[PDB]
Amino acid sequence: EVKLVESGGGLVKPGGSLKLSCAASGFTFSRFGMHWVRQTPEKRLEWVAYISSGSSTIYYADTVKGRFTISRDNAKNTLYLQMSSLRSEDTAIYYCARSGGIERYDGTYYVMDYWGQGTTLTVSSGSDIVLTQSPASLTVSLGQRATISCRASESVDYYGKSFMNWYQQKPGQPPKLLIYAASNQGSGIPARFSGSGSGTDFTLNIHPVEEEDAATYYCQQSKEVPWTFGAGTKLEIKRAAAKGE
């Protein structure tokens, strides 16, 4: 089984610098591209940086360009993120995620599949594709239907395939992939989760809901750099009245 362990976070002063590390195990690290993604105290997910297996292709988010540097050491199975000129907007939990390919009859589809537990950073005193997700929260009775919607600012279709993915996150855990390519079931993901849509409009349906489905749900597009996420929907489960004879 694949495992990623991040380290190096802490509380730091504005203007300073820091280096984060991630130790990988359970897979051949040198064959895979890798990402860093952060999550703010308000629970917004923001992609930060990507590095290819041979350190030859590298991408950064606009808000971190010039201040952050991603690197890797394939012999020691470790990924790094160095940060300088730190400011308030950088306070977040930082996660490392693997870029894993799902082989299919029409191509290999790359998605953020396994994520680590994260490491926390706190800074002390002193034409992207936008995804519009709704509702902000909802409460559903056991066995009934949850429905969540996404509108993208431009099409996420690329010759008949839609690059829309859905994630589930429970408190204390990283996000988990549920649905890829708009409507394809992840491995081992139960049939009660289903996704649909195309072009700019997408939906996630959960039915019949179960007690363990209380969580926050996020859409994400992987058609163009930067990878972007919707704002998140918090689902709660309502107790139903007991039935008599």
Side-chain angles (χ1 to χ4, degrees), residues 183-217:
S183 56
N184 275 339
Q185 220 67 16
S187 211
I189 300 304
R192 66 176 183 275
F193 299 95
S194 73
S196 66
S198 70
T200 59
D201 289 301
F202 301 87
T203 56
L204 178 70
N205 271 272
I206 313 170
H207 177 255
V209 301
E210 301 282 356
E211 191 75 48
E212 66 263 29
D213 298 337
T216 302
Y217 296 85

PDB file of all heavy atoms in Angstrom, residues 183-217:
ATOM      1  N   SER A 183     -18.017  10.732 -14.889  1.00  0.00           N
ATOM      2  CA  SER A 183     -18.994   9.687 -14.580  1.00  0.00           C
ATOM      3  C   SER A 183     -18.378   8.316 -14.304  1.00  0.00           C
ATOM      4  O   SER A 183     -19.125   7.329 -14.188  1.00  0.00           O
ATOM      5  CB  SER A 183     -20.040   9.565 -15.702  1.00  0.00           C
ATOM      6  OG  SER A 183     -19.434   9.318 -16.963  1.00  0.00           O
ATOM      7  N   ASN A 184     -17.058   8.210 -14.192  1.00  0.00           N
ATOM      8  CA  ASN A 184     -16.408   6.919 -14.016  1.00  0.00           C
ATOM      9  C   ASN A 184     -16.183   6.672 -12.527  1.00  0.00           C
ATOM     10  O   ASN A 184     -15.684   7.544 -11.809  1.00  0.00           O
ATOM     11  CB  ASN A 184     -15.065   6.906 -14.742  1.00  0.00           C
ATOM     12  CG  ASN A 184     -15.191   6.548 -16.190  1.00  0.00           C
ATOM     13  OD1 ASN A 184     -16.172   5.935 -16.611  1.00  0.00           O
ATOM     14  ND2 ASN A 184     -14.210   6.958 -16.981  1.00  0.00           N
ATOM     15  N   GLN A 185     -16.603   5.497 -12.072  1.00  0.00           N
ATOM     16  CA  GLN A 185     -16.464   5.074 -10.684  1.00  0.00           C
ATOM     17  C   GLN A 185     -15.010   4.764 -10.335  1.00  0.00           C
ATOM     18  O   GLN A 185     -14.334   4.024 -11.055  1.00  0.00           O
ATOM     19  CB  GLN A 185     -17.304   3.808 -10.490  1.00  0.00           C
ATOM     20  CG  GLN A 185     -18.058   3.716  -9.197  1.00  0.00           C
ATOM     21  CD  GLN A 185     -19.154   4.747  -9.082  1.00  0.00           C
ATOM     22  OE1 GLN A 185     -19.560   5.362 -10.070  1.00  0.00           O
ATOM     23  NE2 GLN A 185     -19.655   4.932  -7.869  1.00  0.00           N
ATOM     24  N   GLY A 186     -14.522   5.332  -9.232  1.00  0.00           N
ATOM     25  CA  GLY A 186     -13.225   4.941  -8.722  1.00  0.00           C
ATOM     26  C   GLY A 186     -13.225   3.496  -8.251  1.00  0.00           C
ATOM     27  O   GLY A 186     -14.262   2.856  -8.068  1.00  0.00           O
ATOM     28  N   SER A 187     -12.023   2.955  -8.059  1.00  0.00           N
ATOM     29  CA  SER A 187     -11.908   1.552  -7.687  1.00  0.00           C
ATOM     30  C   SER A 187     -12.437   1.332  -6.270  1.00  0.00           C
ATOM     31  O   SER A 187     -12.027   2.016  -5.326  1.00  0.00           O
ATOM     32  CB  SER A 187     -10.453   1.103  -7.797  1.00  0.00           C
ATOM     33  OG  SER A 187     -10.379  -0.266  -8.150  1.00  0.00           O
ATOM     34  N   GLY A 188     -13.375   0.399  -6.127  1.00  0.00           N
ATOM     35  CA  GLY A 188     -13.981   0.126  -4.839  1.00  0.00           C
ATOM     36  C   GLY A 188     -14.985   1.151  -4.338  1.00  0.00           C
ATOM     37  O   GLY A 188     -15.482   0.996  -3.215  1.00  0.00           O
ATOM     38  N   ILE A 189     -15.322   2.174  -5.122  1.00  0.00           N
ATOM     39  CA  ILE A 189     -16.260   3.208  -4.676  1.00  0.00           C
ATOM     40  C   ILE A 189     -17.687   2.709  -4.891  1.00  0.00           C
ATOM     41  O   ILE A 189     -18.065   2.415  -6.032  1.00  0.00           O
ATOM     42  CB  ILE A 189     -16.023   4.524  -5.435  1.00  0.00           C
ATOM     43  CG1 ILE A 189     -14.599   5.027  -5.199  1.00  0.00           C
ATOM     44  CG2 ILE A 189     -17.035   5.608  -4.998  1.00  0.00           C
ATOM     45  CD1 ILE A 189     -14.264   5.192  -3.742  1.00  0.00           C
ATOM     46  N   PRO A 190     -18.530   2.675  -3.852  1.00  0.00           N
ATOM     47  CA  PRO A 190     -19.888   2.114  -4.001  1.00  0.00           C
ATOM     48  C   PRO A 190     -20.780   2.843  -5.001  1.00  0.00           C
ATOM     49  O   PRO A 190     -20.666   4.053  -5.222  1.00  0.00           O
ATOM     50  CB  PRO A 190     -20.470   2.156  -2.581  1.00  0.00           C
ATOM     51  CG  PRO A 190     -19.452   2.743  -1.700  1.00  0.00           C
ATOM     52  CD  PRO A 190     -18.186   2.994  -2.456  1.00  0.00           C
ATOM     53  N   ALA A 191     -21.717   2.079  -5.577  1.00  0.00           N
ATOM     54  CA  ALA A 191     -22.569   2.571  -6.656  1.00  0.00           C
ATOM     55  C   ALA A 191     -23.492   3.707  -6.231  1.00  0.00           C
ATOM     56  O   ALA A 191     -23.998   4.428  -7.102  1.00  0.00           O
ATOM     57  CB  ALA A 191     -23.422   1.422  -7.212  1.00  0.00           C
ATOM     58  N   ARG A 192     -23.719   3.896  -4.925  1.00  0.00           N
ATOM     59  CA  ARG A 192     -24.606   4.978  -4.490  1.00  0.00           C
ATOM     60  C   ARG A 192     -24.034   6.359  -4.789  1.00  0.00           C
ATOM     61  O   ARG A 192     -24.793   7.334  -4.792  1.00  0.00           O
ATOM     62  CB  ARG A 192     -24.957   4.840  -3.004  1.00  0.00           C
ATOM     63  CG  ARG A 192     -23.773   5.025  -2.033  1.00  0.00           C
ATOM     64  CD  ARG A 192     -24.278   4.966  -0.580  1.00  0.00           C
ATOM     65  NE  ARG A 192     -23.239   5.208   0.416  1.00  0.00           N
ATOM     66  CZ  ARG A 192     -22.416   4.282   0.893  1.00  0.00           C
ATOM     67  NH1 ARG A 192     -22.501   3.014   0.515  1.00  0.00           N
ATOM     68  NH2 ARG A 192     -21.486   4.637   1.773  1.00  0.00           N
ATOM     69  N   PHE A 193     -22.726   6.469  -5.072  1.00  0.00           N
ATOM     70  CA  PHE A 193     -22.135   7.720  -5.542  1.00  0.00           C
ATOM     71  C   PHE A 193     -22.168   7.700  -7.067  1.00  0.00           C
ATOM     72  O   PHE A 193     -21.635   6.774  -7.686  1.00  0.00           O
ATOM     73  CB  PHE A 193     -20.673   7.878  -5.076  1.00  0.00           C
ATOM     74  CG  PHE A 193     -20.502   7.900  -3.571  1.00  0.00           C
ATOM     75  CD1 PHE A 193     -20.198   6.725  -2.881  1.00  0.00           C
ATOM     76  CD2 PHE A 193     -20.632   9.083  -2.852  1.00  0.00           C
ATOM     77  CE1 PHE A 193     -20.061   6.723  -1.501  1.00  0.00           C
ATOM     78  CE2 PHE A 193     -20.502   9.086  -1.465  1.00  0.00           C
ATOM     79  CZ  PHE A 193     -20.216   7.913  -0.790  1.00  0.00           C
ATOM     80  N   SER A 194     -22.765   8.719  -7.688  1.00  0.00           N
ATOM     81  CA  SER A 194     -22.713   8.751  -9.144  1.00  0.00           C
ATOM     82  C   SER A 194     -22.554  10.180  -9.651  1.00  0.00           C
ATOM     83  O   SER A 194     -23.158  11.116  -9.117  1.00  0.00           O
ATOM     84  CB  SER A 194     -23.914   8.032  -9.786  1.00  0.00           C
ATOM     85  OG  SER A 194     -25.109   8.761  -9.660  1.00  0.00           O
ATOM     86  N   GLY A 195     -21.800  10.326 -10.739  1.00  0.00           N
ATOM     87  CA  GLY A 195     -21.584  11.644 -11.305  1.00  0.00           C
ATOM     88  C   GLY A 195     -22.084  11.697 -12.734  1.00  0.00           C
ATOM     89  O   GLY A 195     -22.169  10.665 -13.398  1.00  0.00           O
ATOM     90  N   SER A 196     -22.425  12.888 -13.221  1.00  0.00           N
ATOM     91  CA  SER A 196     -22.964  13.051 -14.568  1.00  0.00           C
ATOM     92  C   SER A 196     -22.685  14.476 -15.031  1.00  0.00           C
ATOM     93  O   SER A 196     -22.262  15.330 -14.251  1.00  0.00           O
ATOM     94  CB  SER A 196     -24.468  12.753 -14.600  1.00  0.00           C
ATOM     95  OG  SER A 196     -25.192  13.718 -13.844  1.00  0.00           O
ATOM     96  N   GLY A 197     -22.894  14.714 -16.319  1.00  0.00           N
ATOM     97  CA  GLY A 197     -22.764  16.040 -16.891  1.00  0.00           C
ATOM     98  C   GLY A 197     -21.759  16.069 -18.027  1.00  0.00           C
ATOM     99  O   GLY A 197     -21.079  15.086 -18.322  1.00  0.00           O
ATOM    100  N   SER A 198     -21.664  17.241 -18.656  1.00  0.00           N
ATOM    101  CA  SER A 198     -20.687  17.458 -19.723  1.00  0.00           C
ATOM    102  C   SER A 198     -20.582  18.953 -20.010  1.00  0.00           C
ATOM    103  O   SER A 198     -21.424  19.751 -19.590  1.00  0.00           O
ATOM    104  CB  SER A 198     -21.047  16.675 -20.993  1.00  0.00           C
ATOM    105  OG  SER A 198     -22.195  17.218 -21.623  1.00  0.00           O
ATOM    106  N   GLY A 199     -19.527  19.323 -20.736  1.00  0.00           N
ATOM    107  CA  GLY A 199     -19.335  20.708 -21.118  1.00  0.00           C
ATOM    108  C   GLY A 199     -18.995  21.595 -19.941  1.00  0.00           C
ATOM    109  O   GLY A 199     -17.874  21.523 -19.425  1.00  0.00           O
ATOM    110  N   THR A 200     -19.962  22.424 -19.495  1.00  0.00           N
ATOM    111  CA  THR A 200     -19.780  23.297 -18.335  1.00  0.00           C
ATOM    112  C   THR A 200     -20.610  22.922 -17.105  1.00  0.00           C
ATOM    113  O   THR A 200     -20.428  23.550 -16.056  1.00  0.00           O
ATOM    114  CB  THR A 200     -20.095  24.764 -18.696  1.00  0.00           C
ATOM    115  OG1 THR A 200     -21.447  24.873 -19.165  1.00  0.00           O
ATOM    116  CG2 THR A 200     -19.155  25.302 -19.772  1.00  0.00           C
ATOM    117  N   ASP A 201     -21.516  21.940 -17.184  1.00  0.00           N
ATOM    118  CA  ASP A 201     -22.463  21.668 -16.101  1.00  0.00           C
ATOM    119  C   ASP A 201     -22.370  20.211 -15.640  1.00  0.00           C
ATOM    120  O   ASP A 201     -22.484  19.289 -16.458  1.00  0.00           O
ATOM    121  CB  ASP A 201     -23.881  21.972 -16.583  1.00  0.00           C
ATOM    122  CG  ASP A 201     -24.123  23.469 -16.748  1.00  0.00           C
ATOM    123  OD1 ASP A 201     -23.985  24.214 -15.757  1.00  0.00           O
ATOM    124  OD2 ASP A 201     -24.393  23.906 -17.884  1.00  0.00           O
ATOM    125  N   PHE A 202     -22.187  20.009 -14.328  1.00  0.00           N
ATOM    126  CA  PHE A 202     -21.929  18.691 -13.730  1.00  0.00           C
ATOM    127  C   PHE A 202     -22.689  18.544 -12.413  1.00  0.00           C
ATOM    128  O   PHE A 202     -23.023  19.535 -11.760  1.00  0.00           O
ATOM    129  CB  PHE A 202     -20.412  18.481 -13.509  1.00  0.00           C
ATOM    130  CG  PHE A 202     -19.613  18.574 -14.778  1.00  0.00           C
ATOM    131  CD1 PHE A 202     -19.143  19.802 -15.242  1.00  0.00           C
ATOM    132  CD2 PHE A 202     -19.409  17.436 -15.548  1.00  0.00           C
ATOM    133  CE1 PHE A 202     -18.463  19.885 -16.432  1.00  0.00           C
ATOM    134  CE2 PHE A 202     -18.714  17.517 -16.745  1.00  0.00           C
ATOM    135  CZ  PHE A 202     -18.244  18.737 -17.186  1.00  0.00           C
ATOM    136  N   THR A 203     -22.967  17.279 -12.019  1.00  0.00           N
ATOM    137  CA  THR A 203     -23.706  16.970 -10.796  1.00  0.00           C
ATOM    138  C   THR A 203     -23.123  15.744 -10.113  1.00  0.00           C
ATOM    139  O   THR A 203     -22.699  14.800 -10.779  1.00  0.00           O
ATOM    140  CB  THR A 203     -25.201  16.689 -11.064  1.00  0.00           C
ATOM    141  OG1 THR A 203     -25.339  15.640 -12.028  1.00  0.00           O
ATOM    142  CG2 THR A 203     -25.938  17.946 -11.547  1.00  0.00           C
ATOM    143  N   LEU A 204     -23.107  15.755  -8.773  1.00  0.00           N
ATOM    144  CA  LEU A 204     -22.847  14.556  -7.972  1.00  0.00           C
ATOM    145  C   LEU A 204     -24.135  14.180  -7.232  1.00  0.00           C
ATOM    146  O   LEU A 204     -24.744  15.032  -6.570  1.00  0.00           O
ATOM    147  CB  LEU A 204     -21.707  14.801  -6.967  1.00  0.00           C
ATOM    148  CG  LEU A 204     -21.372  13.619  -6.029  1.00  0.00           C
ATOM    149  CD1 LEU A 204     -20.727  12.491  -6.815  1.00  0.00           C
ATOM    150  CD2 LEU A 204     -20.446  14.035  -4.885  1.00  0.00           C
ATOM    151  N   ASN A 205     -24.574  12.923  -7.367  1.00  0.00           N
ATOM    152  CA  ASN A 205     -25.749  12.420  -6.648  1.00  0.00           C
ATOM    153  C   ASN A 205     -25.324  11.320  -5.683  1.00  0.00           C
ATOM    154  O   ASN A 205     -24.575  10.422  -6.068  1.00  0.00           O
ATOM    155  CB  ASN A 205     -26.801  11.856  -7.621  1.00  0.00           C
ATOM    156  CG  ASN A 205     -27.792  12.907  -8.097  1.00  0.00           C
ATOM    157  OD1 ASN A 205     -28.825  13.144  -7.465  1.00  0.00           O
ATOM    158  ND2 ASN A 205     -27.481  13.549  -9.216  1.00  0.00           N
ATOM    159  N   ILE A 206     -25.800  11.381  -4.439  1.00  0.00           N
ATOM    160  CA  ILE A 206     -25.605  10.296  -3.462  1.00  0.00           C
ATOM    161  C   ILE A 206     -26.969   9.746  -3.052  1.00  0.00           C
ATOM    162  O   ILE A 206     -27.785  10.469  -2.455  1.00  0.00           O
ATOM    163  CB  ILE A 206     -24.829  10.764  -2.221  1.00  0.00           C
ATOM    164  CG1 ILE A 206     -23.600  11.576  -2.624  1.00  0.00           C
ATOM    165  CG2 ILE A 206     -24.439   9.564  -1.352  1.00  0.00           C
ATOM    166  CD1 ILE A 206     -22.927  12.270  -1.467  1.00  0.00           C
ATOM    167  N   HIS A 207     -27.227   8.467  -3.365  1.00  0.00           N
ATOM    168  CA  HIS A 207     -28.521   7.859  -3.047  1.00  0.00           C
ATOM    169  C   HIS A 207     -28.447   6.339  -3.135  1.00  0.00           C
ATOM    170  O   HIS A 207     -27.999   5.811  -4.163  1.00  0.00           O
ATOM    171  CB  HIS A 207     -29.599   8.344  -4.025  1.00  0.00           C
ATOM    172  CG  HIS A 207     -30.940   7.713  -3.814  1.00  0.00           C
ATOM    173  ND1 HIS A 207     -31.441   6.735  -4.647  1.00  0.00           N
ATOM    174  CD2 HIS A 207     -31.888   7.925  -2.871  1.00  0.00           C
ATOM    175  CE1 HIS A 207     -32.638   6.371  -4.222  1.00  0.00           C
ATOM    176  NE2 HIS A 207     -32.933   7.078  -3.146  1.00  0.00           N
ATOM    177  N   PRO A 208     -28.903   5.599  -2.109  1.00  0.00           N
ATOM    178  CA  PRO A 208     -29.418   6.062  -0.804  1.00  0.00           C
ATOM    179  C   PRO A 208     -28.273   6.479   0.126  1.00  0.00           C
ATOM    180  O   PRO A 208     -27.291   5.748   0.208  1.00  0.00           O
ATOM    181  CB  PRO A 208     -30.066   4.803  -0.202  1.00  0.00           C
ATOM    182  CG  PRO A 208     -30.225   3.843  -1.302  1.00  0.00           C
ATOM    183  CD  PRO A 208     -29.255   4.193  -2.389  1.00  0.00           C
ATOM    184  N   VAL A 209     -28.383   7.632   0.801  1.00  0.00           N
ATOM    185  CA  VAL A 209     -27.302   8.054   1.689  1.00  0.00           C
ATOM    186  C   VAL A 209     -27.239   7.131   2.902  1.00  0.00           C
ATOM    187  O   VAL A 209     -28.248   6.563   3.344  1.00  0.00           O
ATOM    188  CB  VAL A 209     -27.389   9.533   2.121  1.00  0.00           C
ATOM    189  CG1 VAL A 209     -27.353  10.469   0.923  1.00  0.00           C
ATOM    190  CG2 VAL A 209     -28.614   9.786   2.972  1.00  0.00           C
ATOM    191  N   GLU A 210     -26.028   6.974   3.436  1.00  0.00           N
ATOM    192  CA  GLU A 210     -25.759   6.181   4.632  1.00  0.00           C
ATOM    193  C   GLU A 210     -25.133   7.061   5.707  1.00  0.00           C
ATOM    194  O   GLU A 210     -24.629   8.154   5.423  1.00  0.00           O
ATOM    195  CB  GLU A 210     -24.802   5.020   4.329  1.00  0.00           C
ATOM    196  CG  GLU A 210     -25.311   4.069   3.270  1.00  0.00           C
ATOM    197  CD  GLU A 210     -26.358   3.099   3.796  1.00  0.00           C
ATOM    198  OE1 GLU A 210     -26.647   3.098   5.014  1.00  0.00           O
ATOM    199  OE2 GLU A 210     -26.921   2.353   2.974  1.00  0.00           O
ATOM    200  N   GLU A 211     -25.139   6.552   6.942  1.00  0.00           N
ATOM    201  CA  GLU A 211     -24.629   7.309   8.086  1.00  0.00           C
ATOM    202  C   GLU A 211     -23.188   7.771   7.876  1.00  0.00           C
ATOM    203  O   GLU A 211     -22.832   8.899   8.241  1.00  0.00           O
ATOM    204  CB  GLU A 211     -24.725   6.445   9.340  1.00  0.00           C
ATOM    205  CG  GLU A 211     -24.482   7.158  10.657  1.00  0.00           C
ATOM    206  CD  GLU A 211     -25.660   8.011  11.077  1.00  0.00           C
ATOM    207  OE1 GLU A 211     -26.801   7.503  11.042  1.00  0.00           O
ATOM    208  OE2 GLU A 211     -25.447   9.175  11.467  1.00  0.00           O
ATOM    209  N   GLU A 212     -22.341   6.924   7.289  1.00  0.00           N
ATOM    210  CA  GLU A 212     -20.927   7.256   7.126  1.00  0.00           C
ATOM    211  C   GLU A 212     -20.652   8.267   6.015  1.00  0.00           C
ATOM    212  O   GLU A 212     -19.481   8.600   5.790  1.00  0.00           O
ATOM    213  CB  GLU A 212     -20.101   5.995   6.873  1.00  0.00           C
ATOM    214  CG  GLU A 212     -20.434   5.326   5.565  1.00  0.00           C
ATOM    215  CD  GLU A 212     -21.414   4.184   5.720  1.00  0.00           C
ATOM    216  OE1 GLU A 212     -22.246   4.219   6.658  1.00  0.00           O
ATOM    217  OE2 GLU A 212     -21.354   3.250   4.892  1.00  0.00           O
ATOM    218  N   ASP A 213     -21.671   8.756   5.306  1.00  0.00           N
ATOM    219  CA  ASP A 213     -21.457   9.682   4.200  1.00  0.00           C
ATOM    220  C   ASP A 213     -21.389  11.151   4.634  1.00  0.00           C
ATOM    221  O   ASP A 213     -21.148  12.024   3.786  1.00  0.00           O
ATOM    222  CB  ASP A 213     -22.546   9.492   3.126  1.00  0.00           C
ATOM    223  CG  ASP A 213     -22.540   8.090   2.487  1.00  0.00           C
ATOM    224  OD1 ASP A 213     -21.500   7.386   2.511  1.00  0.00           O
ATOM    225  OD2 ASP A 213     -23.605   7.678   1.961  1.00  0.00           O
ATOM    226  N   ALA A 214     -21.618  11.460   5.915  1.00  0.00           N
ATOM    227  CA  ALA A 214     -21.366  12.811   6.420  1.00  0.00           C
ATOM    228  C   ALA A 214     -19.900  13.197   6.199  1.00  0.00           C
ATOM    229  O   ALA A 214     -18.995  12.507   6.686  1.00  0.00           O
ATOM    230  CB  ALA A 214     -21.686  12.857   7.910  1.00  0.00           C
ATOM    231  N   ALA A 215     -19.671  14.317   5.486  1.00  0.00           N
ATOM    232  CA  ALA A 215     -18.355  14.724   4.990  1.00  0.00           C
ATOM    233  C   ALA A 215     -18.474  16.035   4.195  1.00  0.00           C
ATOM    234  O   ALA A 215     -19.589  16.550   4.006  1.00  0.00           O
ATOM    235  CB  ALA A 215     -17.789  13.637   4.071  1.00  0.00           C
ATOM    236  N   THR A 216     -17.354  16.590   3.725  1.00  0.00           N
ATOM    237  CA  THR A 216     -17.343  17.704   2.778  1.00  0.00           C
ATOM    238  C   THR A 216     -16.932  17.191   1.401  1.00  0.00           C
ATOM    239  O   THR A 216     -15.965  16.427   1.281  1.00  0.00           O
ATOM    240  CB  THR A 216     -16.394  18.820   3.249  1.00  0.00           C
ATOM    241  OG1 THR A 216     -16.793  19.278   4.558  1.00  0.00           O
ATOM    242  CG2 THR A 216     -16.391  20.011   2.274  1.00  0.00           C
ATOM    243  N   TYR A 217     -17.651  17.621   0.362  1.00  0.00           N
ATOM    244  CA  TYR A 217     -17.447  17.165  -1.019  1.00  0.00           C
ATOM    245  C   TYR A 217     -16.958  18.324  -1.898  1.00  0.00           C
ATOM    246  O   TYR A 217     -17.436  19.454  -1.757  1.00  0.00           O
ATOM    247  CB  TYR A 217     -18.772  16.566  -1.572  1.00  0.00           C
ATOM    248  CG  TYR A 217     -19.195  15.311  -0.803  1.00  0.00           C
ATOM    249  CD1 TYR A 217     -19.930  15.399   0.388  1.00  0.00           C
ATOM    250  CD2 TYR A 217     -18.805  14.049  -1.237  1.00  0.00           C
ATOM    251  CE1 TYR A 217     -20.271  14.225   1.137  1.00  0.00           C
ATOM    252  CE2 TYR A 217     -19.134  12.889  -0.518  1.00  0.00           C
ATOM    253  CZ  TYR A 217     -19.862  12.976   0.658  1.00  0.00           C
ATOM    254  OH  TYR A 217     -20.145  11.796   1.333  1.00  0.00           O
TER     255      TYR A 217
END
